[PDB]
Amino acid sequence: YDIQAWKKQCEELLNLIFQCEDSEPFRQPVDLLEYPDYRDIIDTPMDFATVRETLEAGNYESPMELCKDVRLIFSNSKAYTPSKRSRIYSMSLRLSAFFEEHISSVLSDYKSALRFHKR
Numbered sequence: 001y002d003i004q005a006w007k008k009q010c011e012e013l014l015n016l017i018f019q020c021e022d023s024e025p026f027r028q029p030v031d032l033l034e035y036p037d038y039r040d041i042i043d044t045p046m047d048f049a050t051v052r053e054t055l056e057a058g059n060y061e062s063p064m065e066l067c068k069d070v071r072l073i074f075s076n077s078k079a080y081t082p083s084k085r086s087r088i089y090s091m092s093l094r095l096s097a098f099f100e101e102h103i104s105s106v107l108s109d110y111k112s113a114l115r116f117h118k119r
């Protein structure tokens, strides 16, 4: 029932994501010089360095906020891809499966701890 445990759990999961080769396109903001029409398609950029920095600054209140920004990484990749077969999009789908498999217990434990707190 530890209401604060989610934060270290999210730090450890971001460390695994940075070790995965599939994360490399998503570690830093998309390069607008490589992709000059990016902002004509994507309204809100997001990357794993920004997520990590927001967490370490104390600017997430809950793991649900962090999950919403990680899901935006994946939805931007799906919106920007020219093909469902593209290399970078294909990397996003494997990394999304790994994230969703690991975040499920973080969310469940946090929401259980808050219910116990308000009992």
Ligand SMILES: Cc1cccnc1O
Pocket (backbone or CB within 6 Å): 025, 026, 030, 035, 076, 077, 078, 080, 081, 088, 089, 092
């Ligand atoms: C998702 C994405 C697609 C194309 C280029 N870079 C990215 O990060």
